[PDB]
Amino acid sequence: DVAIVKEGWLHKRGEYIKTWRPRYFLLKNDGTFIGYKERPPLNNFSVAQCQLMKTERPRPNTFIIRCLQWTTVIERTFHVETPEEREEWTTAIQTVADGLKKQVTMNEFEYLKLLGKGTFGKVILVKEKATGRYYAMKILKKEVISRHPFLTALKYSFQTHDRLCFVMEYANGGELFFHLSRERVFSEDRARFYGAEIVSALDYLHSEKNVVYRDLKLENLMLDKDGHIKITDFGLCKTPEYLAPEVLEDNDYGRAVDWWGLGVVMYEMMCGRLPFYNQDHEKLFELILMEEIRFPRTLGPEAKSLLSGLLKKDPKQRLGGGSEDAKEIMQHRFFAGIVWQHVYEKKLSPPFKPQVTSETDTRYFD
Numbered sequence: 215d216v217a218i219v220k221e222g223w224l225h226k227r228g229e230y231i232k233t234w235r236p237r238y239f240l241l242k243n244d245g246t247f248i249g250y251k252e253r254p255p256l257n258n259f260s261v262a263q264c265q266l267m268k269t270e271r272p273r274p275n276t277f278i279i280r281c282l283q284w285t286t287v288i289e290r291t292f293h294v295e296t297p298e299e300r301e302e303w304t305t306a307i308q309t310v311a312d313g314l315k316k317q318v319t320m321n322e323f324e325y326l327k328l329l330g331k332g333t334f335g336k337v338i339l340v341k342e343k344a345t346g347r348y349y350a351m352k353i354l355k356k357e358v359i360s361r362h363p364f365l366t367a368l369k370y371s372f373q374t375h376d377r378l379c380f381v382m383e384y385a386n387g388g389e390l391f392f393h394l395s396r397e398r399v400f401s402e403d404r405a406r407f408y409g410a411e412i413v414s415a416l417d418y419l420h421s422e423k424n425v426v427y428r429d430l431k432l433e434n435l436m437l438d439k440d441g442h443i444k445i446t447d448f449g450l451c452k453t454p455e456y457l458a459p460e461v462l463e464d465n466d467y468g469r470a471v472d473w474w475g476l477g478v479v480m481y482e483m484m485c486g487r488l489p490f491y492n493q494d495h496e497k498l499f500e501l502i503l504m505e506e507i508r509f510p511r512t513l514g515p516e517a518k519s520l521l522s523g524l525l526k527k528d529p530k531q532r533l534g535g536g537s538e539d540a541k542e543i544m545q546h547r548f549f550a551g552i553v554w555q556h557v558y559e560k561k562l563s564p565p566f567k568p569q570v571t572s573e574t575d576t577r578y579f580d
């Protein structure tokens with residue numbers, strides 16, 4: 215019993231590519247907004263509680279859909295030729311979101327250092343004075359508008375007169391990218407450990423939160439004191455190496471995006487090098503799409519078959535792209551002999567203990 219409010223052609227600026235491309239967009243009553251390469255539901259495509267901008271720069275008659283998703287502000291910009299069509303779309307979208315909607319101080323946190331800076335806000339490392347704990351704080355411009363073992367938990371959320379703050383857990387066992395850099399390669403077991411905890415997390419986001427992480431890379435993986443994995447959520451509205459082929463063409467991305475990303479991350483750990491690397495970005499784009507995956511000829515076939523299935527070009531042919539989603543990967547030979555309920559319960563003994571005295575140890579901040 216879901217109806218379409220409006221439907222038509224629009225010029226969409228690529229979310230990852232700076233050029234304009236024509237896509238066929240559909241606006242359903244539930245608040246879904248999906249574009250297609252040609253005329254033929256993850257919460258990523260939701261237009262629920264989004265802002266609508268009307269700009270004339272660079273291209274005239276351009277409108278932007280500013281959305282706050284969890285703790286990250288996203289922008290979706292579109293172009294139409296006639297100024298009246300922009301009015302027909304904006305009034306339609308707004309009425310949908312409107313109809314869809316109807317149906318602690320900062321004084322406890324010492325500013326330690328700046329972690330990042332974006333268009334609508336910053337990320338700062340802070341210390342909770344009362345407990346001496348270390349958290350990351352997303353502060354976002356107010357004008358813009360439950361917990362998993364391996365996700366950086368959102369602990370607090372409060373407002374000021376002009377900005378909106380999100381206090382999130384900050385792992386103190388260092389970043390996984392640097393850890394890989396010291397060892398320069400990871401054992402199959404260690405990579406299996408790390409991959410497993412991610413699979414559990416991706417399953418959570420997909421099956422329960424109904425969302426795609428969409429930016430799974432080495433730079434977003436950290437370790438807690440014990441050695442378990444924390445997937446970070448520190449993105450602001452500011453890398454072509456990790457991009458999926460489906461995201462490249464800007465057509466119908468889905469849960470498979472996270473599975474492509476997983477393959478790339480697990481490749482770097484067991485191979486020690488990026489699967490598709492080139493200084494030239496344009497050659498790297500042709501590399502991802504056209505070139506066939508290569509291997510060091512020193513890996514167990516299980517891992518080789520896992521990465522092969524994860525780094526296939528077609529999202530539906532790609533491992534975990536089907537309806538079963540994560541379970542396709544959980545049943546894999548490389549993940550045979552692993553009890554997954556124990557993975558979620560942190561029952562898995564970490565192959566690496568970060569050199570940390572306690573939760574509050576500040577060694578890995580150098």
Ligand SMILES: *CCC(=O)Nc1ccc2[nH]c(=O)n(C3CCN(Cc4ccc(-c5nc6cc[nH]c(=O)c6cc5-c5ccccc5)cc4)CC3)c2c1
Pocket residue numbers: 229258283284285286287288289290333360365366367419423425426427428429445446447449450451452
């Ligand atoms: C200015 C730059 C810009 O606009 N970039 C941009 C453009 C378009 C984008 N579309 C996108 O999808 N993104 C992504 C936004 C999300 N982000 C990663 C990410 C994914 C999921 C979560 C998350 N979401 C929820 C939702 C509901 N309940 C939850 O408990 C959630 C938890 C999480 C979560 C996941 C991991 C760790 C902690 C919490 C958060 C972030 C990638 C880009 C665009 C970006």
